[PDB]
Design a protein around this ligand. Structure first.
Ligand SMILES: *[C@@H]1O[C@H](CO)[C@@H](O[C@@H]2O[C@H](CO)[C@@H](O[C@@H]3O[C@H](CO)[C@@H](O)[C@H](O)[C@@H]3O)[C@H](O)[C@H]2NC(C)=O)[C@H](O)[C@H]1NC(C)=O
Ligand SMILES: *[C@@H]1O[C@H](CO)[C@@H](O[C@@H]2O[C@H](CO)[C@@H](O[C@@H]3O[C@H](CO)[C@@H](O)[C@H](O)[C@@H]3O)[C@H](O)[C@H]2NC(C)=O)[C@H](O)[C@H]1NC(C)=O
Ligand SMILES: *[C@@H]1O[C@H](CO)[C@@H](O[C@@H]2O[C@H](CO)[C@@H](O)[C@H](O)[C@H]2NC(C)=O)[C@H](O)[C@H]1NC(C)=O
Ligand SMILES: *[C@@H]1O[C@H](CO)[C@@H](O[C@@H]2O[C@H](CO)[C@@H](O)[C@H](O)[C@H]2NC(C)=O)[C@H](O)[C@H]1NC(C)=O
Ligand SMILES: *[C@@H]1O[C@H](CO)[C@@H](O[C@@H]2O[C@H](CO)[C@@H](O)[C@H](O)[C@H]2NC(C)=O)[C@H](O)[C@H]1NC(C)=O
Ligand SMILES: *[C@@H]1O[C@H](CO)[C@@H](O[C@@H]2O[C@H](CO)[C@@H](O)[C@H](O)[C@H]2NC(C)=O)[C@H](O)[C@H]1NC(C)=O
Ligand code: NAG
Ligand code: NAG
Ligand code: NAG
Ligand code: NAG
Ligand code: CA
Ligand code: CA
Ligand code: CL
Ligand code: CL
Ligand code: ZN
Ligand code: ZN
Ligand code: ZN
Ligand code: ZN
Lengths: 677, 677
């Protein structure tokens, strides 16, 4: 039983595994990450899994030239290089003989050497570009931003720079965003030093996976596009720097002043938007490189053709002390603990798949390619996907993002768990979590957020429509994210010395997987979807109601969507009444298939407009505001900035079309829960 | 049991129903076709079905103006109208007071009145246009074809006329194709009179359904495209005529002579290709019009969430004596006969749905819109679709088109059936059928053809991947197709006076539905798919091998596809070994779900290139040669006329890409039949 599974999970094992995974870099495509997969594969066999295989793919990765390094430069009238930005970050104490620490870089930047003049675009948001462009008539055709990391995914920032004429992008981490007041820089606290740099890719893949093989696995015989026709590649060069090097670049800045205090950071500098009072040197290659996923299987006893997936990435930028090895060490113990039960002759009712994804930091490629190869199995047999990236990004409370179908599983599960929090000894995890992080949407309940994008759950949820969730410990990003300073020491000393937060996360993830793989009726409550569908309908109605005149002229009705939502509510009601009153494997299967296929019902096979790989009509990143935008993304995007569009009847036509699509889809989902005949 | 079901089917009932359905026209969108649906709905209730509902949709139909009629004209230098083509066909004996016989027309032709000069393009094929264009340097920018009906679907002919610059299309039925030697015209034989005209739509929908709502059901709140953005509408006017009126138009024809005897018909005329030695008058409107499908349900006893569908259209051009009421009368008796068993307390193991589709003659709209609304139910619960259009187009033997998954069901089923043929009394239907129509592909077995397109099975098979078949009696089209002369009398006197062919077809369709709805293991044999996948791979390899040089230069390998096919063969083998050795409802369900989802595995969610609604990678009409082209249509189309392409490496790149897509898909389908964990 469940208590058995949980009591076998130990914090010391997690510590032991974390240390084991974090002593060298495990960058996607390198021999070191191959050896770590081989090790995971042995260990998962030893732990008891029925099978453990490597699944490999040949995907487009990106690396800096080991002999013509990347850097930015200040240049005078006569073309001399005054300031040079750092080539490496200062390694942390005791890691000076680290072999193969890849230097800071923006994965997938084209090579270039553009000269030109700075322009500070704040966070390089849509909002921020509407500030320069719309109000202050600033124009960047030929100019170079400079932008601070934060708020939005970094690929949107480069996309936004592209759209707006820019010819280079410089990315830096400002202390306002990544320097917690009152705590010391690493190694003496958990803050970002001035020499630290956030790595990361700057792709805009919109769920496509490997840029060369959209739709199909990058296997041994795959036909690859040319780099010219590739999906999501930037056209302008990009490089990240720490705040010491950004000081130098930003201090001599002139032109217009900042519009307000929200456009100024905490460096002792004017934060002058420019233009004028820079030369980039990049040099990174793209190359097809083999990646390795590890897939463990624990065959179910009664329903072996029904899959519950616990999955997380293994690849790191450098040591990945938090991101992802704090997740992977939790997955390792969970596997050990399941295999322990298995060894005592137990099996789960459904099959559990365990995955160690590769090349996640390069655009979710391991998970995506694997899903593309097995989409047929996943879509007819996939019960649920629990992600397992970073277990901690803080030590305050639990963060859960999941489909509404899993709200009660998560509420119930955490009432049976002991809080690890200071001043909540004896109290439950439900208790601490809901005291520390209450629901804004009412009432005496914890906040659970929407699943968005940008981790490995993406392909499962947003393309395939498999019910997904994630859980981790969070703050009230985290400063050392994607720098060399992200180490085991960072976690043992400053984040979780007992490893009690790690263990709590393991119990939430492990217990979710347990409940999903073992409970006789799937632990989904479709009435929860009904409740949020109403909220989301109200929300989107409100955004439209900021244009009352246009709604009258073009006859923009939301009646169909509210009608669909009401029907969903009634049918889901009648359906849960039936789920309680019934005995008989076939009736059981049928009702579970209905529960399982419900999330699937929200997938439109045509996808969203210009994003064929985002097929979920309810959730699914907005094309503009990515995780930051709203649900019913098709309607939200049709409405976004609609007052600016040239042909209003055409633009309002498309709002109506998206109302239709959403209403139809909600009604169709509902009807999967009607009696079957 | 089955013999019970079959013995209850009676020929007299079929006769009785056919007469009942054929006394007035039942054109899509008219009150008469509404009343016929209401009647079917009552009767299906009376017969015993658990439910029978109307499902309606508002779709784009097309009608001639009842007061400004359509016609073609010959015109002199001074603009006078010498020859006028007929306004109606001469009604058959006893039907002179037929109310609301719609006159001959080409459904969905735009209105126009173009003047210009004839050009005879034979059957207006791709092949035939390569004759004029490539060899004889004939050029039609501004000219009017004239073309004979035959060989290809009539919409391809108008598409081909469009592509080639033409400004009108005239369609006529030549006696060479529609006049069987030695038999008299209707009413004294079954031949086409000179006054008879083939109606039909000329859409190129490529599976889209309602031209205004591609992807989504045309329901009460649907957003409709503008006619300008509509899918598959022709741009040039089109009108059909009988051969008496075509004589007049073709006799004064000059310019170049016919290239051979395959370009000349059997009218006493030169068959001069033109140009020169005509004015069209059209006038038809398009309008959104309500259609009504009738859906009957016979709830299954053990697996009510698994659907077997028997479906056929009800709408006719005029009386529909063969097309479709000879099908629908068979469906009616089948339903009666199932409901009879039901009334004696029996139920099928799986649910059976019975459908009377509407607006099929207007581009498969009833079936398609219904499938678009219920795609989610169909794709997870759909076992099989048996079509039920025209039961007879001849009286020689059985024609069966079906997925390879149904070969053995059909072989087995016909060995248990009595042949209705002259000189085969006592012998089985398998016996007559295979003597009369042997397999070319070896050996002592009957020919079974590929399912193509152009009837209501299309959306189920080609878009949704639901295993489908059809069966009918055929000749060694049929002359009166889509004319007013297609009557009950045509069938009772000349085609099937006993109604013994009708009854044989009812037993084949009914017994297929019976076996599929009742057998404990689904009656699919996946090894049959393995066999034809090899044939299809060999075939497509051969077409490519006509370009050996280019295969060397661009490294065009079919290794991946043969490898995929071999794996399919091995896995399907191992899978049938398991299907025989096993006991336990859950294991039964699982193995059936594997069998059921196998056809589904051949669906690519991205569709074929520029045809998003044809998603089956194996079958599925070619973009060029439609039912006439080959399997692996994506590869076939990439290769078609490839020597003419401007950029050979780009064109050969796309052949390779389609090899990849096909190989991947075959491998992925196979793997659904591997052990599940
Ligand atoms: C939510 O569920 C209800 C069913 O409880 C759906 O109501 C349906 O609404 C349409 C009108 O929007 C009705 O259409 C009407 O059909 C009659 C013939 O039946 C026709 O003569 C009228 O002109 C009209 O077109 C439909 O029958 C009605 N069904 C009911 C009330 O039982 C509603 O559409 C559902 N919402 C969505 C978004 O699907
Ligand atoms: C049909 O099934 C067979 C399996 O029986 C598939 O064979 C597989 O073929 C590829 C090469 O095309 C092998 O890849 C190799 O992997 C090794 C590591 O395992 C690597 O070091 C090599 O460089 C190479 O990339 C694969 O392992 C092999 N599996 C076998 C023989 O067991 C074949 O691909 C299937 N056909 C299709 C179209 O899927
Ligand atoms: C992480 O732990 C594993 C195993 O617990 C270590 O791998 C083993 O190392 C010993 C000593 O070299 C060998 O006997 C085995 O060959 C290894 N087993 C494997 C690879 O599965 C591994 O070295 C540890 N890593 C670190 C850096 O401490
Ligand atoms: C979470 O727990 C609640 C309360 O225990 C469960 O809801 C009850 O479920 C039982 C068992 O089927 C019913 O008999 C009760 O009537 C339910 N009570 C309420 C308040 O609804 C709920 O099923 C659990 N959710 C899960 C496991 O998904
Ligand atoms: C086809 O058969 C049906 C019923 O067997 C006939 O419909 C019935 O006609 C009688 C006489 O008008 C009425 O009592 C009923 O109202 C009808 N029932 C219905 C519509 O379900 C129908 O008229 C026949 N059609 C023809 C042309 O013979
Ligand atoms: C069609 O009939 C053949 C021959 O009767 C069936 O094949 C046999 O099926 C039985 C029953 O499971 C097996 O024990 C035999 O070994 C099979 N014989 C052969 C020659 O394969 C076949 O299953 C039937 N096909 C259907 C109903 O789909
Ligand atoms: C920056 O790098 C270049 C290339 O090595 C060099 O010429 C230049 O002087 C450098 N600047 C400094 C301060 O070293
Ligand atoms: C861990 O816990 C203490 C308790 O408040 C807190 O002060 C400290 O900020 C936490 N560490 C991190 C990295 O957030
Ligand atoms: C053809 O129809 C037009 C329109 O009614 C008429 O003017 C013309 O003379 C007709 N030709 C004949 C032969 O009646
Ligand atoms: C029906 O049967 C006879 C037998 O050969 C044949 O001569 C006649 O052509 C058939 N009728 C039709 C319409 O094919
Ligand atoms: Ca791919
Ligand atoms: Ca439609
Ligand atoms: Cl996570
Ligand atoms: Cl048919
Ligand atoms: Zn991560
Ligand atoms: Zn990361
Ligand atoms: Zn028909
Ligand atoms: Zn027809």
């Amino acid at each position: 039983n469940m208590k058995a599974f949980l009591d076998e999970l130990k914090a010391e094992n997690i510590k032991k595994f974390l240390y084991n995974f974090t002593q060298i870099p495990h960058l996607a495509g390198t021999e070191q990450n191959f050896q770590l997969a081989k090790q995971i594969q042995s260990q998962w066999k030893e732990f008891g899994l029925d099978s453990v295989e490597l699944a490999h793919y040949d995907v487009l990765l990106s690396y800096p030239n080991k002999t013509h390094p990347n850097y930015i430069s200040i240049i005078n009238e006569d073309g001399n290089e005054i300031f040079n930005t750092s080539l490496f970050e200062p390694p942390p104490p005791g890691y000076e003989n680290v072999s193969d620490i890849v230097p800071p870089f923006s994965a997938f930047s084209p090579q270039g050497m553009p000269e030109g003049d700075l322009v500070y675009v704040n966070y390089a948001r849509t909002e921020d570009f509407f500030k320069l462009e719309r109000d202050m008539k600033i124009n960047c055709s030929g100019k170079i931003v400079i932008a601070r990391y934060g708020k939005v995914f970094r690929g949107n920032k480069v996309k936004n720079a592209q759209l707006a004429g820019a010819k280079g992008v410089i990315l830096y981490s400002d202390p306002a965003d990544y320097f917690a007041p009152g705590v010391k820089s690493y190694p003496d606290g958990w803050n970002l030093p001035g020499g630290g740099v956030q790595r990361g890719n700057i792709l805009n893949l919109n769920g496509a996976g490997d840029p060369l093989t959209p739709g199909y696995p990058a296997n041994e015989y795959a036909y690859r596009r040319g780099i010219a026709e590739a999906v999501g590649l930037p056209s302008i060069p990009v490089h990240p720097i720490g705040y010491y090097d950004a000081q130098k670049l930003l201090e001599k800045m002139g032109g217009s002043a900042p519009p307000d205090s929200s456009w100024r950071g905490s460096l002792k500098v004017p934060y002058n938007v420019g233009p004028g009072f820079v030369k980039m040197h990049i040099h990174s290659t793209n190359e097809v490189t083999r990646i390795y996923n590890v897939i463990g299987t624990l065959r179910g006893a009664v329903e072996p053709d029904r899959y519950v997936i616990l999955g997380g990435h293994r690849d790191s930028w450098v040591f990945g002390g938090i991101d992802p090895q704090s997740g992977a060490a939790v997955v390792h113990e969970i596997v050990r603990s399941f295999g322990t039960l298995k060894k005592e002759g137990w099996r789960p009712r459904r099959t559990i798949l365990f995955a160690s994804w590769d090349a996640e930091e390069f655009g979710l490629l391991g998970s995506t390619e694997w899903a593309e190869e097995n989409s047929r199995l996943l879509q007819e047999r996939g019960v649920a996907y629990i992600n397992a990236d970073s277990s901690i990004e803080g030590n305050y409370t639990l963060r859960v993002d999941c489909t509404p179908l899993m709200y009660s599983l998560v509420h119930n599960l955490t009432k049976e768990l002991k809080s690890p929090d200071e001043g909540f000894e004896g109290k439950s995890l439900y208790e601490s979590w809901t005291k520390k992080s209450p629901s804004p949407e009412f009432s005496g309940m914890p906040r659970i957020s929407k699943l968005g994008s940008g981790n490995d759950f993406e392909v499962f949820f947003q393309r395939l429509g498999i019910a997904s969730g994630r859980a981790r410990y969070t703050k009230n990003g985290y400063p050392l994210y994607h720098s060399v300073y992200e180490t085991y020491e960072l976690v043992e000393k400053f984040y979780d010395p007992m490893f009690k937060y790690h263990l709590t996360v393991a119990q939430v993830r492990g217990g979710m997987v347990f409940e999903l793989a073992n409970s006789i009726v799937l632990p989904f409550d479709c009435r929860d979807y009904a409740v949020v569908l109403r909220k989301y309908a109200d929300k989107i109605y409100s955004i439209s109601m900021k244009h009352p005149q246009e709604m009258k002229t073009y006859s923009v009705s939301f009646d169909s969507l509210f009608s669909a939502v009401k029907n969903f509510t009634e049918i889901a009601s009648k359906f849960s009444e039936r789920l309680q009153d019934f005995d008989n494997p076939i009736v059981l299967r049928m009702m579970n298939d209905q529960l399982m296929f419900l999330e699937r019902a929200f997938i439109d096979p045509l996808g969203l407009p210009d994003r064929p790989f985002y097929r979920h009509v309810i959730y699914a990143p907005s094309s503009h505001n990515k995780y930051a935008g709203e649900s019913f993304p098709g309607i939200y995007d049709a409405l976004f900035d609609i007052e600016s569009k040239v042909d209003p009847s055409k633009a309002w036509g498309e709002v109506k079309r998206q109302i239709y699509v959403a209403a139809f889809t909600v009604q169709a989902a509902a009807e999967t829960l009607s009696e079957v005949a």
